[PDB]
Design an enzyme around this catalytic site. Structure first.
Site, mmCIF file in Angstrom:
data_model
loop_
_atom_site.group_PDB
_atom_site.id
_atom_site.type_symbol
_atom_site.label_atom_id
_atom_site.label_comp_id
_atom_site.label_asym_id
_atom_site.label_seq_id
_atom_site.Cartn_x
_atom_site.Cartn_y
_atom_site.Cartn_z
ATOM 1 N N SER A 135 0.802 -1.221 0.000
ATOM 2 C CA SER A 135 0.000 0.000 0.000
ATOM 3 C C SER A 135 0.836 1.274 0.000
ATOM 4 C CB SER A 135 -0.953 0.020 1.204
ATOM 5 O OG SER A 135 -2.071 -0.884 1.119
ATOM 6 N N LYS A 191 0.483 3.858 -2.850
ATOM 7 C CA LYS A 191 -0.614 4.808 -2.979
ATOM 8 C C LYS A 191 -0.125 6.237 -2.959
ATOM 9 C CE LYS A 191 -4.263 1.794 -1.370
ATOM 10 N NZ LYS A 191 -4.130 0.673 -0.479
ATOM 11 N N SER A 236 -6.140 3.851 3.274
ATOM 12 C CA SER A 236 -5.612 2.787 2.432
ATOM 13 C C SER A 236 -6.736 2.087 1.674
ATOM 14 C CB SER A 236 -4.801 1.788 3.251
ATOM 15 O OG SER A 236 -3.675 1.366 2.495
ATOM 16 N N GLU A 277 -5.083 -2.875 -7.736
ATOM 17 C CA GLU A 277 -5.521 -3.600 -6.550
ATOM 18 C C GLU A 277 -6.547 -4.658 -6.941
ATOM 19 O OE1 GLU A 277 -3.521 -0.962 -3.595
ATOM 20 O OE2 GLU A 277 -4.203 -3.082 -3.672
ATOM 21 N N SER A 332 1.086 -3.519 3.998
ATOM 22 C CA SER A 332 1.384 -4.899 4.335
ATOM 23 C C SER A 332 0.849 -5.779 3.226
ATOM 24 C CB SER A 332 0.802 -5.277 5.684
ATOM 25 O OG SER A 332 -0.582 -5.066 5.644
#
Ligand SMILES: [Cl-]
Ligand code: NA
EC number: 3.5.2.6
Length: 259
Positions: free
Chosen positions: A43, A46, A103, A139, A210
């Site tokens: 993440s 981003k 996130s 994603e 993560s």
């Protein structure tokens, strides 16, 4: 080094692979550990998608007000903000904030789609002088973090230098840079990572991540009390596919390099 010894010992005790890059802007010094190895960003990528949209808004000033529909078909694995707006719209500013502060993976995918896909985010990174960053996938699959897989990876050194450019440098216009810093200071997910190894009085803007193989990441801009800012990138990954996250390793690394 002495700091390098302590990081090697932390790494050995942790059982994984640790990458660290600290930039101290007081004296332009660096502390580096495995800093040219690739790690899955998860993440933390981003930040670059949000930065690419902010860069676009320098030329199209009403861009951040543009609305994007959220449909059931957009939902992926983790969408704490987008799921509250299904069948309505969110502005690009709201999606940017959701991506960085919560996130939200729908927010990330909408930012990616707006700028033209993962190769377009990567091209933005190249424009900034970062030839290491690569965003390959959308994603949720960009978080698989398979060992030896270069997709969706960067190095600690490159991410620290790029983060310095984005938050403390002039990669973005003044309004856009201030907005990015504001969003990162408002992150809701970082208290147990780098921040947990720093004094309570210091101010942090960070983005966590993560993923598979126990990958546990954090990238941060830090304002210590009465000192010049720091940039700190801490990436960690483990040998077992179902390893649990280890945010404590990031906190310990932060404590070691800022002592
Ligand atoms: Cl396992
Ligand atoms: Na990078």
């Amino acid at each position: 080094a002495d700091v390098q010894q302590k990081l090697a010992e932390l790494e050995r005790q942790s059982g994984g692979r640790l990458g660290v890059a600290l930039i101290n802007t007081a004296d332009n010094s660096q502390i580096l550990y495995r800093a040219d190895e690739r790690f899955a960003m998860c993440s933390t990528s981003k930040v670059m998608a949000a930065a690419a949209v902010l860069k676009k808004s320098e030329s199209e000033p009403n861009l951040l007000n543009q609305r994007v529909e959220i449909k059931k078909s957009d939902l992926v694995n983790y969408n704490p903000i987008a799921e509250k707006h299904v069948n309505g719209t969110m502005s690009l500013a709201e999606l940017s904030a959701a991506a960085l502060q919560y996130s939200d993976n729908v927010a990330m995918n909408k930012l990616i789609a707006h700028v033209g896909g993962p190769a377009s985010v990567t091209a933005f990174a190249r424009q900034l002088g970062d030839e290491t960053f690569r965003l390959d996938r959308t994603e949720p699959t960009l978080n698989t973090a398979i060992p030896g897989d270069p997709r969706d990876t960067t190095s600690p050194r490159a991410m620290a230098q790029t983060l310095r450019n984005l938050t403390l440098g002039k990669a973005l216009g003044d309004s856009q840079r201030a907005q990015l810093v504001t969003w990162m200071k408002g992150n809701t997910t970082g208290a147990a990572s780098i921040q947990a190894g720093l004094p309570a009085s210091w101010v942090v803007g960070d983005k966590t991540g993560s993923g598979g193989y126990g990958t546990t990441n954090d990238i941060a801009v830090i304002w210590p009390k009465d000192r010049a800012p720091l940039i700190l990138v801490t990436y960690f990954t483990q040998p077992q596919p179902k390893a649990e996250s280890r945010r404590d390793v990031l906190a310990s690394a932060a404590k070691i390099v800022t002592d």
